[PDB]
Design goal:
The protein is mainly beta and 98 residues long. Helix content is 12%, strand content 34%. It has 2 helices and 7 strands; from the N terminus they run E-E-H-E-E-H-E-E-E. Bound molecules: FE2/S2 (inorganic) cluster. The site of FE2/S2 (inorganic) cluster has 12 residues, from loops. It comes from Nostoc sp. (strain PCC 7120 / SAG 25.82 / UTEX 2576).
Length: 98
């Protein structure tokens, strides 16, 4: 199945919805759609690609960096997050990552 993922970031002037397969990570999907999101490790051990899930469910079980509390507030490491429903995500949340 494919899901619609809305990406938001005012500063970067981004507010677009993309359609991606459920086996595609949020970051890869954005990249193939011309949306350049930050990343470093691409392996789940850094804060570079962090986003915040505003609405919807995702799977980021391969992540390592974030803790339960962070995850609970909706933060997700986009390089290892797959959509489980249509969702809305704010990008570039690294500075806000407490
Ligand atoms: S780029 Fe490092 S965790 Fe995603």
């Amino acid at each position: 199945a494919s899901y619609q993922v809305r990406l938001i970031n005012k500063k970067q002037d981004i507010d677009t919805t993309i359609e991606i397969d459920e086996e595609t990570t949020i970051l890869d999907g954005a990249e193939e759609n011309g949306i350049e999101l930050p990343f470093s490790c691409h392996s789940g051990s850094c804060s570079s690609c962090v986003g915040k899930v505003v609405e919807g469910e995702v799977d980021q079980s391969d992540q390592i960096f974030l803790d339960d509390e962070q995850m609970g507030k909706g933060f997700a490491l986009l390089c290892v997050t797959y959509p489980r429903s249509n969702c809305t995500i704010k990008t570039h949340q690294e500075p806000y990552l407490a």
